Each structure stands twice: as structure tokens, then as C-alpha cells.
RNA sequence: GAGCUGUAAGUAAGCUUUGAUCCAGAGAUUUCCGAAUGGGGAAACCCAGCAUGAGUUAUGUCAUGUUAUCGAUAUGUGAAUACAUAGCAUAUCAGAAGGCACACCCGGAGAACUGAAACAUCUUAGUACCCGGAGGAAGAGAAAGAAAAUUCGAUUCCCUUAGUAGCGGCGAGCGAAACGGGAAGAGCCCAAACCAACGUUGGGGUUGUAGGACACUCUAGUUACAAAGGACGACAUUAGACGAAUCAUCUGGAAAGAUGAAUCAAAGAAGGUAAUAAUCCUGUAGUCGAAAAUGUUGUCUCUCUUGAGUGGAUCCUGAGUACGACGGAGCACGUGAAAUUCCGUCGGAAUCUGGGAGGACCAUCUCCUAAGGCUAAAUACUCUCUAGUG
RNA sequence: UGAGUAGCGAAAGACGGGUGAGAAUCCCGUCCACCGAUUGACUAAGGUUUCCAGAGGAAGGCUCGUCCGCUCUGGGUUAGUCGGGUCCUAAGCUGAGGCCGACAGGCGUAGGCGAUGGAUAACAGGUUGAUAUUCCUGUACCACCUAUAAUCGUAUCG
């Protein structure tokens, strides 16, 4: 249970390359932040991405 | 009849079978063909009573 | 009820212990309280005591069935089967 | 094919040409016991008894001329009947 | 249609033309463990609450039903704390759970021995294993496409193009596509502008040889996509029935063999029978049959149903999206002059006189119209069926 | 083949009777010898019918065998009080919600499970070829039910 609540942004997997072009598996996490947003019953604490929080939002 | 069908199976064909099995164990019961004949009589009585409901 | 299966006939049961004690074979899921009520209803006797014991399967390739024999002691009345 | 108590003739074997009455039947194995056929000697004194032969070794003679023949089924009546091949007369 | 009581010879007692056994389609019964679910537990065991019942002078005992945990829906729903948006209790539910087919399908995650005659880029390989979704198939699919012909016109699969173009410590090695010939073949529904109601969907409308809103001429389809709920006739599947034609002699313990004379064929496929059988047996060719239960369909029934819209000033489409930079992955193509496609992090367009593509990039021309969804057939595979084949 | 070769797993036996086709090896008796903080008498774990009786000698028993923990047939385990469940809890192991994790799943609260410990009512004799605080005889105790009599209540149970 680690993903944006307003979107589906999550982490992915890739490679780490060196000068000699050696490969090593790594992860690409997302910029998650704990925020309290309005929900129909009451506000709660959820994980919201920083991309969704841009241009304004309700908290 | 509902009651007659029950009465015939409970007191008869059940206590009657009790004597046959009891008599055989003691070693004084011939006519072995009378046990299976009564065993299947109860099976038919319980088949009509279950479908008649 | 249909809890008794077979009377036991042996030297220990018939020649001895038969003066006032009767041995039977009961179901493998009945306690000694249900054997006292069944004996009286079928044999019209008054039971005073009831002992029970378990037997395990015996290899004979396969094994014989398990048994449970009970001994009842009557206060008044006699079976005389 | 051959019913109990019918009259048949031995077509093959050591007693070819011996009329008899079937007195037993073994449909599970297709064998039939015919009186006077396949007598055997057993040890237990010596009690002579009749063995069973194959059902394909006996034929049914015609009622009119006693001639070995095959059985047919006309099935005119509600119950099917056995009809002699050589003559329509029922066998 | 006369025998029967499994494997199995016996020893017993019995049933059966009042038609037993046996075969097929429907119903009844179905102990305990096991997702196991009243609570425990060393699976097949032990110990309880509630309600209703018999039994017993009463206690002890017994029988039949109910009581797990999570979800979506009623009802009450008074705490910190005088709106209340914590908890907390009862009610309803063909709602979930677990199990397979060393097989096929999509997604997440992801090696090594080996080859390069060593070895790190590279290869073995997105292979083995693991996990999580399914379905009888899945997936993909109605052009922001392929191209350069006086053009074609959704997707998938087969042949060919071709070991060609190209990629590569340009080493080892990897490896296309479009045209052309085939199998199969139908396409549709939403958002928006707008017209009526007090964040239920009610109308309206769906796109490039530009559409719709807005102004304007004016008598069919079927639940396999395209909205979906039934009533109505015929073929097959699961027990069966009828079914042509041979007699002697010799050698044998036994004839079907040998020796003679007769026969049937829309039947000379086979298997048995005391030895090698078209005519002895079971069958074959051919021709018939279904209480009752399934499946495939055909008919009327049933529901649902208004289509061409010449102007054309004003209005409408899908945004933190398209795209750029940085770090990665994927396209035959290793960052390379790398277009086209994706993920994480930041910055951030336009609005039909618009926007995207044609292998960097610009101009001209040509072809299309992204940021919403659904869709059968041609293809892959075989636990286990019913007929067969070498 | 080696070869009728190695070996036959710590130790005291002798004789007289019995059985039988067959006796150094089985049964009975009398002497002798060995252990005796013990090779004796009871009991947990583990094994799972090896326990008793009659009948057997193919194979198994490192020889023999008439014998057996071997083969066949039929038998044998009795609890309100003894040891465990309807009593408690250590370690530890599992935990409604909850916290954290690519997927699985990892932690953890209330609550439960869990003796090797705590609580807790029976003793002495007799009897079978094979069971005994269980069966039997003689005397006890604990919990719970039912009916009938003592304080002539502003008690009693928590």
C-alpha cells in the first residue's frame, strides 16, 4: 500500500550504468508526501504525489 | 399412512432385527436370509416417507 | 436404542462374571450413561453399575476393527438370555 | 441363442451326431451342458460327470424333419418368437 | 427375457416369467476430517452458548436446528466535545474465500553454468524458477496508419520478400518491415457545445471526399459488440432391435486343413470357437428405435425502433495532458546523425488561419485527426471422453 | 575360486527321572556355582500385541531342538478419588482492528494457546492361566440435586 491516492504513480525498476557500462538493478521511487485531504465522510491522512499537488488543491 | 408407516418401521423390523442379530451371536439363529430381507424393508419404508413428506 | 451390537460369550464372561454381570458390545461413540438407559428399556431391568473399556485394532495384510465392551451390574432382575 | 431344455445336435467335437436335452447353461462363459455329452471321470471313488461344451458346437434340429438349422426372429406377436430357417415353423 | 447372490473354487440360507439380477436417463439417503467457518487442536479429536423438544420425583444424559472473519446494503446510530465526520450493537444477501491440466494466455519480478577457444561491453536470455490474474482460448483490433502508385483502407494467422537492409569490443553473434499471393472478415458506444428537471444520467450528438450544436426541404433491428428480461417446431447426444448364405469323405484326442459337390454378397472389417471359417458363434453392409434428460438450431412470438438535413456569421471536441531537459527501459537497431513508443523527477503548448506523421533538423507538398471505452471469425493447447489408424 | 578354510559375540556345570520317530541343548528333582548401591523390586520416554492357554517344526533362532519374543486357533486391559481434560499460568508460539512492505507476506495491541511448576475428595485385605488404589469384602470422603423439621429477618448471596 504505497502509491498516490489521487493517481496511480508508483515505483519502477531499471539499471544502474557505470563508465564501463556495467549493469545493476535499482528502483525509481515516487515523490510521496503525507497530506490530509477532504473526503466525503471526513478528512484523512493519505499519500499524495507532488505532481498532483501542483497548481493548487484542497487540504 | 404417515403414522402407520412409522409405527411399522419403529417397533417392527427394528426390534425384530434386534432379536435376529442377538440370536445369531449366541449361536442359535439359522435362516440367515431373514436379516437382509428385513434390512431392505426399512429402506423402502424410509424412501416413501421421505418423498411423501 | 440400537447401541448394543453383540453379547460376549467367553469363559471369563459366561462361566464367570455371569452370576450378576453381563457383558455387551456397544457403539464406539456412546458413554456409560447411554448404556444404562438402553439396557433397562430393552431388557426391562434395573442397572446398578456400568464399566467400559476400549480396544485397539489388531494386525491380522490388514487390521481387525476396534471394539468397545461394557459390563453392567444389575440390582434387581436377570437377563437370562 | 440356445435356451434351457431345448433339443440340439452336436456339430463338432468327439460326440458329433448325438441328440440330447440341454440341462444347464453358463451364459457368462457361453458354455452349455447337454445330457450324454463330454462325460468325464473325477477322483474323489470315481464319480463320472458331464462337462460343458461351447455354445457354438450345438445346433437346433427342425421340428418337422429333425434337420440342424439356424434360429430367426419374425416378431409377429407382441412377444418375439424363434423361427426355424429351413422352414418357417416355430422352433 | 432365465437365470442370479463382484473379484472366487467352496460352504451355506434364499430371491426370480407376480419377470430377479443386468444396462441407460432422472430423484432419495449420504457418518468423520479437510477452504472447515461456535471455541480449541498434535487433520479425521476434545470442550461450549442460545432456542425448541422429548426422558427424570429433580440433578446427570440425549436428539434436531443455529453462533467464524471480512465486504456491500437497513435500522437505531448522544465521546474526548453544546453541529458531529470515531467506536459500538442487531437485520439481509447464489457476495468473497479454496482446489487444477508436467498444457496453452497476459502482467509483476528476474539468474547462472555456457559461447567469444582467457575476460568485464556483448551472448546464454527476457530463457529456468517464483508470484498474481484469468478465459475456453487469451491477446490485439476500427488509422493522429502504410506509401510516393493514374494510390490502398481495422486486427490476427500462413507463404514470400531473406539470412536481404541494417545492428555489433562492426568481434562472437543478432536480425526487420512494407509491397505481392492466401485463410477469415460486421463494426459500434461515450465526454463536450445545447435543450428540459431538484453531485440519480433525462434528451441532444460522435468526426477528415470536416463533423456537431445552432438555423433549415420532410412518410427496420434480436440479447456473440452494437439496450435487454421470455413464449413458440424440427435434427443430433446419452440404453437398443432386425440383419443373407454348407453339406460329405481321409488323417486327428479334436477340422476351420486336404479331397469332391453346393451357396450367399450394398455383407470377403475383425474377434472367438479342441488346428488355418464369407455361409458354426458374436459381428459387418444396410435399414429402424427414445419414457425421461441435455445441446444445437428454425419459425412466428416477444421487446426495442424517424431517416436524406442545400446556408453557415457566432459556438464544441478529451490538460498539468502533448512536448522539452536529466536518469533508465523498450523498438532487428549496444546513444550513435536515432526518428517512432514507455516509466520516475522537474519545467510546461496550441485551439480548425489548430494540431501530428512521412528515420536529426528546416521549407514545400502529401496523408491523417492523440491525450475515453467495447467488439465474433481465421490462431495456440489436451487432463479426460467416443470411434478409429501404424 | 579361495574351502570344508576363518568364525560361531565376555561367564560352571553334573547326574538321576519324564516326554518322543529322533535329546549335551525341552520338562521335573537333588547337589554345585555367580550377582546382591545388585544381573533384585517399582516406575517416565520410546516400542505397539512382543502379554495368556491349547495345538504345531517348513523358514527365522550363528549347533541341536520335542522348545521359543517364530507359525496356527481362541482369549486378555473394568476408576466421582490414581495420571491428564470441563482449573491457572513461565519461556515460546499465534493474535480482531492497526503499522510497514514490488507480489507473496514481515512485525505487533486487547484477547487466546501452552508444564517440566501452582490448586485439587481412599485407604487396608482378598481373588484370575493373563487386570487391580479400577473387580470383590470391610470402613471413609468430595461436588451437586429432591422433600420434610430448629432463629417467629430492616438474615442470605456479592
Short mmCIF file of C-alpha atoms (C1' of nucleotides) in Angstrom, two decimals, chain F residues 30-121:
data_model
loop_
_atom_site.label_atom_id
_atom_site.label_comp_id
_atom_site.label_asym_id
_atom_site.label_seq_id
_atom_site.Cartn_x
_atom_site.Cartn_y
_atom_site.Cartn_z
"C1'" U F 30 18.57 -83.06 44.04
"C1'" C F 31 23.69 -81.07 44.58
"C1'" C F 32 27.15 -77.24 42.80
"C1'" A F 33 28.35 -72.22 41.04
"C1'" C F 34 27.55 -66.40 40.02
"C1'" C F 35 25.22 -61.14 41.20
"C1'" G F 36 23.44 -58.95 45.62
"C1'" A F 37 24.25 -49.45 45.78
"C1'" U F 38 22.69 -55.62 42.75
"C1'" U F 39 22.19 -59.40 36.95
"C1'" G F 40 16.84 -57.87 42.71
"C1'" A F 41 11.95 -54.80 43.35
"C1'" C F 42 8.84 -50.33 41.21
"C1'" U F 43 8.20 -46.54 37.54
"C1'" A F 44 8.82 -41.76 32.79
"C1'" A F 45 10.28 -41.66 27.40
"C1'" G F 46 10.10 -44.93 23.31
"C1'" G F 47 8.17 -49.63 21.05
"C1'" U F 48 2.89 -51.13 19.73
"C1'" U F 49 0.10 -57.06 20.99
"C1'" U F 50 6.10 -58.81 21.68
"C1'" C F 51 1.12 -60.50 27.28
"C1'" C F 52 -2.22 -65.83 28.49
"C1'" A F 53 -3.76 -71.08 27.00
"C1'" G F 54 -4.10 -75.40 23.76
"C1'" A F 55 -2.05 -77.07 19.16
"C1'" G F 56 2.47 -77.09 15.58
"C1'" G F 57 8.52 -77.60 13.39
"C1'" A F 58 8.84 -75.75 6.57
"C1'" A F 59 11.56 -70.99 7.23
"C1'" G F 60 13.88 -67.44 11.36
"C1'" G F 61 16.98 -68.74 16.22
"C1'" C F 62 25.13 -68.24 14.10
"C1'" U F 63 24.88 -76.10 16.57
"C1'" C F 64 20.69 -79.07 18.17
"C1'" G F 65 15.67 -78.76 19.25
"C1'" U F 66 10.02 -82.43 21.12
"C1'" C F 67 11.47 -75.79 22.81
"C1'" C F 68 10.66 -70.01 21.74
"C1'" G F 69 9.93 -62.69 21.85
"C1'" C F 70 8.89 -67.78 15.39
"C1'" U F 71 3.68 -70.39 12.78
"C1'" C F 72 -1.89 -71.60 13.53
"C1'" U F 73 -6.63 -71.10 16.61
"C1'" G F 74 -9.16 -68.81 20.64
"C1'" G F 75 -8.62 -65.22 24.62
"C1'" G F 76 -6.83 -60.88 27.85
"C1'" U F 77 -6.64 -54.08 29.78
"C1'" U F 78 -13.27 -52.53 34.34
"C1'" A F 79 -11.76 -45.70 38.25
"C1'" G F 80 -16.58 -39.38 41.15
"C1'" U F 81 -10.97 -40.04 44.41
"C1'" C F 82 -4.52 -42.75 40.80
"C1'" G F 83 -2.06 -39.67 35.87
"C1'" G F 84 -4.18 -35.96 32.09
"C1'" G F 85 -9.19 -32.73 30.04
"C1'" U F 86 -14.90 -29.47 31.64
"C1'" C F 87 -8.95 -25.18 36.64
"C1'" C F 88 -4.20 -21.30 36.48
"C1'" U F 89 -0.05 -19.59 34.49
"C1'" A F 90 6.65 -19.18 32.67
"C1'" A F 91 9.50 -19.34 28.31
"C1'" G F 92 7.73 -19.58 23.43
"C1'" C F 93 4.20 -19.78 19.72
"C1'" U F 94 -0.19 -17.48 17.45
"C1'" G F 95 -3.17 -12.54 17.54
"C1'" A F 96 -9.93 -8.86 15.50
"C1'" G F 97 -8.59 -3.57 14.35
"C1'" G F 98 -3.63 -1.45 13.48
"C1'" C F 99 1.79 -0.22 11.42
"C1'" C F 100 5.26 -1.46 7.43
"C1'" G F 101 6.39 -3.84 2.64
"C1'" A F 102 7.28 -4.93 -5.93
"C1'" C F 103 3.74 -9.61 -5.25
"C1'" A F 104 3.82 -13.08 -1.55
"C1'" G F 105 3.99 -11.76 3.23
"C1'" G F 106 7.21 -9.35 7.92
"C1'" C F 107 6.06 -7.06 12.81
"C1'" G F 108 2.54 -6.08 16.73
"C1'" U F 109 -2.22 -4.38 20.81
"C1'" A F 110 -6.65 -6.30 23.55
"C1'" G F 111 -7.53 -11.45 23.61
"C1'" G F 112 -6.27 -16.76 23.40
"C1'" C F 113 -2.96 -21.43 23.20
"C1'" G F 114 0.91 -23.58 26.02
"C1'" A F 115 4.04 -27.89 32.08
"C1'" U F 116 8.88 -29.65 33.00
"C1'" G F 117 5.67 -25.74 38.18
"C1'" G F 118 0.75 -23.88 41.36
"C1'" A F 119 -4.60 -25.80 43.07
"C1'" U F 120 -7.17 -30.28 43.96
"C1'" A F 121 -12.03 -35.81 47.62
#
